[PDB]
Amino acid sequence: AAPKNRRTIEVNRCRRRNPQKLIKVKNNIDVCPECGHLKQKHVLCAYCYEKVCKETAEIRRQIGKQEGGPFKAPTIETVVLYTGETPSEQDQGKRIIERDRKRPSWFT
């Protein structure tokens, strides 16, 4: 089947500017109390999540360096210790991942 006539710009404007086509305004956006960047209420904050992901990447790189190769996952719990921090009694018997920076305030 082929068009029998060219559809006019008036009809085309009707079709493509019908509110069903138009983008819907989102009212679920809100400010993150932690960093103040915008976030959707149900979604996690992009800025804070990126902070956590970068810290996780550093920790995981240290984990890989300590493991030294594939298939060397430890059989014990792991604890991340930052500069100026010593293992506690609970931390005893756990693999220590040392990070060469001050503990982040958000991290606890």
């Binding site: 932690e34 996690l44 956590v52 996780t56 430890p74 014990i76 719990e77 958000w106 991290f107």
Partner: protein, 152 residues
Amino acid sequence: ISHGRVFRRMGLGPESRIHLLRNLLTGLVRHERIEAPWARVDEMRGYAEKLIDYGKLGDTNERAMRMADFWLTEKDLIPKLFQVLAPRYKDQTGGYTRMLQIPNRSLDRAKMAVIEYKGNCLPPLPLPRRDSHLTLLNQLLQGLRQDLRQSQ
């Protein structure tokens, strides 16, 4: 018509779905926190909980060992599953996994989620916290609660 169908249709078929979930779950067991498309994480959360239960069952259980051998494609994680995760959750009875939506993927704008085993060594997620008890509405509701308690 898909009334009562509880399993998503993923990958190239049922086997491919199982294998995709298996890879995601192996990554979850290895790293304790994995970000992946929202639907796949939702589908794999139940299997993660089931592996935690099978690890609770114990090393000596041949059925649990077979399940772990199948599901953990990297065999170094089976000792982990049985000696780090299950002992960690021995006290708990469920809810071993925390799943939270993430800003859509930059590449294809896919709905993504991060799923982690609770109590992992990794930095805590920016968890959504309920409003403080000291807010106006919460204080008014506290007044309601105190009045009811005094009445009874």
